[PDB]
Design a protein around this ligand. Sequence first.
Ligand SMILES: Cc1cccc(-c2nc(Nc3ccncc3)c3ccccc3n2)n1
Length: 293
Amino acid sequence: IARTIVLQESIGKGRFGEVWRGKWRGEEVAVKIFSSREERSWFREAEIYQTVMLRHENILGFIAADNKDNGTWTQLWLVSDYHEHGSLFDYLNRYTVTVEGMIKLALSTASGLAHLHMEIVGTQGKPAIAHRDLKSKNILVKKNGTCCIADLGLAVRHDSATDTIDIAGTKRYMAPEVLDDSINMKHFESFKRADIYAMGLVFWEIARRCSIGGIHEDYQLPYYDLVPSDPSVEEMRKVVCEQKLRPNIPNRWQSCEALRVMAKIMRECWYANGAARLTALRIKKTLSQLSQQ
Ligand SMILES: Cc1cccc(-c2nc(Nc3ccncc3)c3ccccc3n2)n1
């Protein structure tokens, strides 16, 4: 618990709160600390992570939510597993990946999203969940080369029985329908589809780093040469919705079977119409088969 955790190093900032590398009984763990005025964000994220049957190898492992009074003010804590590599963003900026490495990153990410999206029926049932803010900066890389999804604070949970959501993201990754406000937020399926579009962008970031024969593209965020670094909804909307542009597909990707499969998936994730996009499960299937080949 928070009572015996010692913070050692600042390792990042979340939408709200700061992330630290702490030690729990000698073991390294990750700690996200919120202020008293950020209680709703802290609570909502703790709520999502405590969803029944949520644990999965491709979802950040949640340890606990707690309060810690230092004598002057109260800190609101969330504790999880610690991954030295940090975000996929950091990973892709620092390294290049092999074909096998790329598939593992993409496959693990898709498996995590498919788990989130999938409703598990049963007495201890897991509701379908949509992320709403998927990006390379909140996907983490484990020591074994696989990814796990984090930052579930903006997630929404579905109630299949009544087809309603339990409650009422990053501009660059916002889906077309989100950018132009045409998305039907009363339809849970629309949130799932919007997540697919974002995963498509992430896949593009990974593929660029797939080095074959010492050849590869430099790391870049999707739309790096079409919009400013911290783009607004309008700037994104004009490019994605009006000009209808998507990340450029290097001709180099046509030389490798793996890259060809990855590219096809991306295209099928970027359709302006969410209903036309692939599902996380289908993507997982395709990547799983490619992995076997
Ligand atoms: C629920 C919870 C508890 C503790 C930390 C985080 C967290 N951690 C991030 N990083 C890392 C986690 C583990 N090892 C290294 C880095 C996040 C990164 C981006 C957005 C949210 C994060 N939340 N979330």
